[PDB]
Every structure is written in C-alpha cells, then in structure tokens.
Design a protein around this ligand. Structure first.
Ligand SMILES: NC(=O)c1ccc[n+]([C@@H]2O[C@H](COP(=O)([O-])OP(=O)(O)OC[C@H]3O[C@@H](n4cnc5c(N)ncnc54)[C@H](OP(=O)(O)O)[C@@H]3O)[C@@H](O)[C@H]2O)c1
Ligand SMILES: NC(=O)c1ccc[n+]([C@@H]2O[C@H](COP(=O)([O-])OP(=O)(O)OC[C@H]3O[C@@H](n4cnc5c(N)ncnc54)[C@H](OP(=O)(O)O)[C@@H]3O)[C@@H](O)[C@H]2O)c1
Ligand SMILES: NC(=O)c1ccc[n+]([C@@H]2O[C@H](COP(=O)([O-])OP(=O)(O)OC[C@H]3O[C@@H](n4cnc5c(N)ncnc54)[C@H](OP(=O)(O)O)[C@@H]3O)[C@@H](O)[C@H]2O)c1
Ligand SMILES: NC(=O)c1ccc[n+]([C@@H]2O[C@H](COP(=O)([O-])OP(=O)(O)OC[C@H]3O[C@@H](n4cnc5c(N)ncnc54)[C@H](OP(=O)(O)O)[C@@H]3O)[C@@H](O)[C@H]2O)c1
Lengths: 248, 248, 254, 254
C-alpha cells in the first residue's frame, strides 16, 4: 500500500508504461482515473484492476483535447472526492523522417499529443490538487532530446524536451502550494513505442544494463515520484533509463 | 572579418539580440538575410548595415509561417548564391499567467512563434546549407526551462526547452553532412524582452556577473557558433548567461 | 519491509541523513553495517536498531582509510552473508573560504573525505556485490557543484561533482553485471552540515537557505533517507548512472 | 589578433591541445607563459613562438606542485606586467583498469594531476587576474564523467567532473570582480591522450572513437584550441560558469 489513500489520474493508460502504472498504483492502494483513445483497451485494463480489489474509472478521448482534461479531473473529483496525483504519460513517436521531408501538420500533431496535452493536463489538474493541499504531477519525457539525439525524430525529441521546461516552470510556480512536479525519462522499454517493437540487440546495447526495461520497472519509478517517499523531490528530470544517458 | 565569405539568415532581427547579431555578422563579412514582423525596424536595420559597407536583404513576415521560411531561404540563394549559416533567434515571452488561467490559444501561439518557427526554419534552411556542403544552425533558447523555472512562464519555458531537444536530434541527424546545430541560451539581456524593460536590480543580481548583458555580447556568442572556430561544436546548449544558471 | 532481504552498508551513519537512512533501512527490513568516526554515536544507533528488533553491525574508522572500507565489506559478508547495497553518504564541507586563502592540505583533506572515500568504498564494495549477482551503490553528492556555485566552497563543490563523474564511469563499467550506480543530490537538509545550522550562523541564514528551495523549506533528514531507500530498492531496478536530485526544487529555483 | 593585449598562462603546453593553444594564442596577439614537465618540448615551442615573432616564456614543473603555480603567475606578472587569462589544460588519463584492481596511489596521482592542479592554478591565478580588473580562467574537463561513462576510467572521469564543480563555485565566488570561469570539454581529439592513439591500441579503436561523434571524426587539436581562444576572448564576456562542449556531438550521439 505505497499509495494508500491517494487518487491518481493516469494518461496513456491503454498499453505499456501507462497500463503497468495504472495497474501498479491501484494494487498499491490508489484510486485511479484512466484515459487513452482506445476504449477497448481501457475496458480490459479497468477489468483487470477490478477483481484485483482496486477501484478505477475510465474516460476515452484524445489527450490533445481541452475538454477531455477538464472532464477527466471532474471525474476524479466526482467518483473519488478529489485528486492527489497525476501521471501524465500519454505520448507517441508521431511523424518521423528526415527534417526537410516532414510536414508542419505532422509537427503540430506530435507536439499536440506530447506537449500541449501536458499543458492542458496541468491546467485542469492543478486546481483539484491544490484543493487537497498537495501534492504531485509527473510527466513522461524521454532521454531522447535530453541526453541523446537520433536521425528522423526531431518532433518527438523537441516535444519531450519541452516537458522538461514545463516541469521546471511549474515546480517553481507551484512549490509554495505543496505540489511537486517532476519529469520521468524512460530509456528503451518493452512496448509498441520501442523501435524494437536485429533491432532488439541494437536497442538493448544502448543501455548500461544491456537489456530493455519491463514496463513495470518504469511504473515503479512513477510510483516513487507520486509517493510520500518523494516529498523533497520536485523540478527533477528522473532518468529511469538503464544507463542509456551515459552509455556510448 | 570573422565571418568573411559566409551567407547568414538572422530571424527576430528587428530588435535586441537579433538586431545586434545581424549588424555584427555584416560588419564581420557575412552577407545577411534578415527577418522580423516589423518592416519599419527592418528598414532602419538594413539601412545601418548599408553604409557600414555590408550587404543585407530583408523579408518581413510572421516567423510561424511556413511560406516565410521557404521564401527567406529562396532569397538568400537568389541574392547571395547560397546559405552557410542561420541564427534562428525569433521568439517572444508570449502569454504569461498562472498555469490554470492560461488559454490553449495563448499556449499554441507561444509554441508556434518560439518552437514551430524553428522546425520550419530547419526544414527550409538545411537543404540550402547541405548544398554548400555545410555548416551551421543556431537557435536562441533560454536558461529559462533549462536551468531555472519562474512563476507564470510555463509556455515560454516549455518552448525554449523544446529547442534543446530539436538541437540534439538535428545535430545527430545532420552531423555526417557537416551541418553543426547548437542552441544559444542567453541570460538577462538589455532588450524589451527582459523583465526589467526595482526590477532592474533584482534582474542583475540573478547573474554571477551582477549585471545584464549588452545585446552585442550575446551576438558575439552567436558569431562564435557560426564561425570556423566552432568547427567541432555541435549538439551543444551554450550558456551565454553571465552565470545565471549557477547563481542562486 | 521495503528492503526485506537486503544487506546494506551506510557511511556517515552517526548523524543527519546517514543516521536516518541506516535506521530507516533497518526498520524496513535490511541488515545494516554502519560507519562514521564517532564510535559512541554508532553504538547508540545500533543499540536503537537492535532494540527495535532490527539487525545492525558497527565499525568506527576514517572513511578516507582503505583498510576501513575493506573491513566494512568483510564485516557485512561475515556477519550477514553477503552485500547487496551501499549508501556511501559520508561527507563534510571541509575547509571553506576565499580560493586564494585555502591550503592545499585543507583541499586534499576535503577531497579525501568526500571523494577518495567513494573510490575506496567502490573498490571493496563492488566484488562483494558482484558475488551476489548484482545490487547497487549510491553516493551522496550535492546540488552544489552540479547546478549551483556558492562563494567559499570550492573544495566541497569539486569533491561533490567528482562523485557524479565516478557514478557515470562505474554505471557503465558495472552495468552488464547487474550493479546499478547512482548519485543522490540533496538540497538543504536540517542537519549539522547545513549552512544555517553552523556554529556560527547569522539568524538570517535559515530563511536564506529555506528560500533557496521551490518547496520553501529545508528537508527533514528522513526525506533524503526515503530517496536513498528508493535507489537501493527493487523499485529502482532500471535506474542507473543517474544523479537524482532530492533537493526541494533548489536546482531550478532562483 | 584575436587576443591582442592578453597575457595568458597555458598548462599542458608540451603537446596536443595545450601546445596548439599556446601557439594559437601567441600567433593571435597574446603574451603566453607555458608549462609542462618536458622542458625540451617547451623550449622548442617557445623557440617556434619567438621566431614567428610572438612572445612566450616557459617554466617546466609538475602541475601538481604548488610552488610551480605560484612561480608561473610570478613569471607572467614579472615578464609581461600582469595576467588576464589562464587555460588550465594539463591532464592525463592516469591509471586505468577495473575499479577493484586500482591502487589508491594511482587514484591520488590521477586526481592530483587533473584536479588538485586546478585548485592550485586558481589559488595563484585569481589574485593576479583580479589585480588587472578581471579576465578569465578556463579548465579543460572532458565529456567523460559529464555526459558519458566508459569502463576502466573511474579516476579520470571523477577528476574531470570535479573540475565542473570547481568551475561553478569559482564562477559565483569571482563573478562580481569580473573574472569569468568556465570548463571546456573536448570530444575525441587527435593527440597522444586519445584512446585510439595509445601504445597499445587495437586497429578498430580509431573507427570506434570517430564513430562516437555526430561529426564522425576526431578533432584536430587546433579545433579545441579555437574553443579555448573563444572563451579567453572578449567575445565570451557574458560566458561564465559554463561547461562548453567542444565535442563534435559526442555527448548527444549514441
Ligand atoms: N517505450 C520506450 O522505449 C520509451 C522511451 C522513452 C520515452 N517513452 C514514453 O513513454 C510514454 C508511454 O509510452 P509506452 O512506451 O508505454 O508506449 P505505448 O505502449 O504506445 O503507450 C502510449 C500511450 O499513449 C497514448 N496516446 C498516443 N496518442 C494519444 C492521443 N492522441 N490521445 C490519448 N492517448 C494517446 C496511447 O493510447 P491510445 O493509443 O489508446 O490512445 C497509449 O495508451 C510515452 O509518452 C512515450 O513517448 C517510451
Ligand atoms: N532578453 C533576455 O533577457 C532573454 C533571455 C533569454 C532568452 N531570450 C531570447 O532571446 C531571443 C531574442 O530576443 P531579445 O531578448 O533580443 O528580445 P526582443 O528585443 O523582443 O527581440 C525579439 C525578436 O523576435 C521577433 N518576433 C516575435 N514574434 C515574432 C513573430 N511572431 N514573427 C516574426 N518575429 C517575431 C521580434 O520581431 P517583430 O516583433 O518585429 O516581429 C524581434 O525581432 C528571443 O528568442 C528571446 O526569447 C532573451
Ligand atoms: N545537509 C545538507 O544540507 C546537505 C546538502 C547536500 C549534500 N549533503 C551531504 O549529505 C551527506 C550527509 O551529511 P549530513 O547533512 O547528514 O551532515 P552530518 O549530520 O554532518 O553528517 C555527516 C556524516 O559524515 C561523517 N563523516 C565526516 N567526515 C568523516 C570522516 N572523515 N570519516 C568517517 N565519517 C565522516 C560524519 O560522522 P563523524 O563525524 O562521526 O565521523 C557524519 O556521520 C554528506 O555527504 C553531506 O556533504 C548535505
Ligand atoms: N585527447 C582527447 O581525446 C581528450 C578528450 C577529452 C579531454 N582531454 C583533455 O585535454 C587536455 C589536453 O590533453 P591532450 O589531448 O592534448 O593530450 P596530451 O597530448 O597528452 O597533452 C597532455 C599535456 O598535459 C601535460 N601533463 C600531464 N601530466 C602532467 C603533470 N603531472 N605535470 C605538468 N603537465 C602534465 C603533458 O605534458 P608533459 O608530459 O610534458 O608534462 C601534456 O603537455 C587534458 O586535460 C586531457 O585530459 C583530451
């Protein structure tokens, strides 16, 4: 029960990290509000949470929409009575390709899904969290655009790096109200988002640990940042990347 | 003549840093293509360059528009024969305020002017630079969102941090073609963009040097990143911030 | 029982962050081996631990001495059967003052205490941890010398930053054998080492130090200990090569 | 004449980056005072400098010795009238190998050469620079221990990272008096210290090292010297407390 008593939003819940996090947080005593575009995946997820003994509510929607973010928090407060924490984990690789071939349409979709989503998440989540008197927001960034670049990925890397800026700003803006704000930066994790999913070997070799994370290991880092154990952690870009940052 | 022979685009040219950079680059032997929204300022700028003995061309436009970026490079190649370097310096504080009061409209304008502009700049500039066989793009970021947060500034901080991600991605993507890509991160500089413009004292105290930069000192750092002296500098987020990053 | 089954060394265990961390680890299930210079302080801590029904062993010595680190690891292995984790936390501000006034003696002593100690810890800790099939080493660095400079603390800042280079090298060297290596970087923490608490201090220092933090308060040592427990925990299985700021937002606050 | 009027100390001046930087600074107008252990190498460099009609003075000594740094500054002030800038560049990979195999002697000697030297440089350089009304100190660090770890180089990585902490502390301490303090962090550079060039090296190392860089090539020493000239130049008047990567994109390349 490392999150006992907490009420959490998890976005990007329908697979890999988000899914493992919603499941873990619920196991550990948090009441979870989940979201993703794929209602069918959400239903398999909320099913699995129920009958593990946990409570979860879902809302299907596009994480780029302002009205989803508002509704999502309204839900948390309706169903469970308030909101303690949010794991803003939605994002996608988006459109990839050599810089000069990319469309501005593709650039804006990627930034909308990965970075505008986080602004809107903050915009609605912060009042409800400030109401319980604290205390946390975590955003899934990436080592990509923070400690490494790759060919073909400029929109994703810019969107992920932007989350670090948003985190530093919010952490200072909300610190006095007792809301911590951190970025979580996975390395290669075993999900459809991973280039691997001879690629597998190449990807594992990127990490000092010489393997790819299970999604549950990234959820555990998200669980830490949402826990009371992280009461003095804010404005941080926590690398849970198996050493990928420091491996060449 | 530290830039002799070079052909440069400078965006955000109509005041402070951009203006000092266009003037400096021209003094130092580069042919300069300048842009900003304010045609009247551009005319005072191109005037001052002429009769210093330098050559400059201008195009007035919104740096968020794809067609400006295309036209701008076409100009450089039309008027001067190609393109060596670009100082992507356009940006603005944009809409400020406590996170939950901000509009998504205001968020998207700020990101458009500060970060989408840079993608579009890259999209058109890289082919013309790859044509001369190299070699540079510099983008004006900020210490804000990289080493510091402030209340009320989340969209600016996210947009500025995003430029660092875009830089790391492009630097790896284009390194093999001989195009260096760097971010330049000013601290407080004496321009209308500076909070100062009892604020003055507070701002100066933010820096280890206990003063605000002249715009010409930031141009000098931009001149270095565009120079042959920076032939082994790429993927770098160069702090020209008077120590603001490390001062508490 | 967050660290049930773990065998941990904790250095700088006689006060502050180190004491809270050795107590916390033991209360959470770990068998703990504790060190500091003050043998009477260690003895009261192990008494408290074994007493609340935990398990601890103590060895007093200078953390800059190679024989002490060797015998620490011998004590964990002997008494408890192995070594899974180390929290290499001992450190001291060392001699402070304007750069041209400092002695090289004072500089070397600061480095030896803060940084040479970490090399010697690693030198003896690594074979024992590797024997178990893997585990972790955590070193207490600081936000000072990583995201901030202050006047008068050049030896301290150098020594703390040096731990981050040691961390990155060892995370790569040891990663394929399952040993994670991280730095933990506290903000202002309410201990004898905090600027505000020195002998010494102007009244206004406490407010100055608190105001350095986005949270606008100085950490209880327990808060830093929970971060160190995170990093030693199985919950940190994919965290290595990191410099984890547990600094209340100090790094980003101006 | 990019440094016309400047009086500069350059350490590690007998080869590599340091030699190219002392030559370059002098060819660009600075009066240069050069040091390394190899007195015959220094003498050929000053001969070349004074000879191309520049001005240089030499003093051979161990960069880990306090008396050497004191006398270096005495030599600049005496011969040239002041001190504006230092390029504290001397460094050595030092003893390398798996962490449990390294001696504490080898560790201390690496640190003394790479990091204690920087403290002693600063201790004597700062009063002389301050006398002039300000200037700069630049220290050659490395991307290793800042954005990368490698196996077998723990002392080197620690010592190089430590320079960044020293930089941040001194930039704050000295900034109000107009002394800028920066670290310069090269990538692979074609000198005797480069992995590929060691005695030693497997054929395939050169390609491995080149491929570490976004530019896909190892730097000529002159390229790193131009970066150091930037940081000593008036063009870097608002650059302090920075760790400038002149590393060909190594930091961001995987
Ligand atoms: N996997 C890695 O190796 C790795 C490395 C670094 C960072 N990350 C980051 O890790 C986070 C979690 O992703 P994962 O690795 O677990 O990949 P994943 O398996 O694809 O999970 C991504 C989640 O984001 C959601 N998403 C995408 N577009 C959305 C939209 N427009 N509206 C609402 N949700 C949307 C998806 O939901 P629907 O498709 O059902 O909407 C899905 O639930 C992401 O932010 C990713 O960028 C992953
Ligand atoms: N000043 C500081 O203290 C400080 C600190 C950190 C970072 N920066 C960054 O430094 C860079 C240069 O700004 P500055 O400090 O020199 O401030 P400034 O005096 O306001 O110059 C900003 C330039 O950006 C242009 N701009 C804004 N919106 C535009 C648009 N929509 N379309 C085309 N151009 C637009 C402006 O041109 P028009 O208005 O004529 O279009 C102006 O030429 C900016 O990216 C800024 O964010 C400044
Ligand atoms: N307090 C803060 O605000 C703050 C901020 C950032 C980083 N840190 C770091 O946090 C870590 C814990 O310090 P703290 O705040 O808990 O202060 P503390 O209360 O003074 O604890 C320091 C501990 O290190 C031990 N130590 C010092 N020199 C030693 C030596 N030569 N040989 C063996 N042990 C030695 C001391 O024990 P004996 O004297 O009994 O040997 C004491 O147990 C240190 O590395 C410190 O630098 C503290
Ligand atoms: N080469 C690279 O790939 C690379 C990468 C990152 C950082 N660096 C750093 O770059 C800086 C310059 O090295 P380099 O590449 O130019 O290699 P280098 O050719 O070996 O030059 C090293 C210089 O430092 C001097 N030195 C070493 N130990 C000394 C001591 N104890 N006392 C006085 N001088 C000493 C050497 O001179 P004597 O032997 O004549 O005294 C030599 O002049 C060093 O700090 C190095 O660590 C190099």
């Amino acid at each position: 029960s490392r999150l006992e008593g907490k009420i959490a939003i998890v976005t990007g819940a329908s697979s890999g990290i988000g899914r493992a996090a919603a499941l873990l947080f619920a196991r550990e005593g948090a009441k979870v509000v989940v979201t993703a575009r794929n209602g069918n995946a959400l239903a398999e997820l909320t099913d699995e949470i129920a009958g593990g003994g946990g409570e979860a509510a879902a809302l299907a929607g596009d994480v780029g929409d302002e009205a989803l973010h508002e509704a999502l928090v309204e839900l948390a407060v309706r169903r469970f009575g308030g909101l303690d924490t949010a794991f803003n984990n939605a994002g996608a690789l988006g459109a990839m390709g050599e810089i000069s071939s990319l469309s501005v349409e593709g650039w804006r979709e990627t930034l909308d899904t990965n970075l505008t989503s986080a602004f809107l998440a903050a915009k609605y989540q912060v009042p409800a969290i400030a109401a319980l008197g604290g205390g946390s927001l975590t955003f899934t960034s990436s080592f990509v655009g923070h400690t490494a670049g790759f060919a073909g990925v400029a929109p994703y890397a810019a969107s992920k790096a932007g989350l670090i800026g948003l985190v530093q700003a919010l952490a200072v803006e909300l610190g006095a109200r007792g809301i911590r704000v951190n970025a979580l930066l996975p390395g290669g994790t075993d999900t459809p988002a991973n280039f691997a999913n001879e690629t597998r070997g190449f990807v594992e070799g990127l990490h000092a640990l010489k393997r790819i994370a299970r999604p549950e290991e990234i959820a555990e880092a998200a669980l830490y940042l949402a826990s009371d154990g992280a009461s003095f952690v804010t404005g941080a870009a926590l690398l849970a990347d198996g050493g990928a940052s420091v491996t060449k």
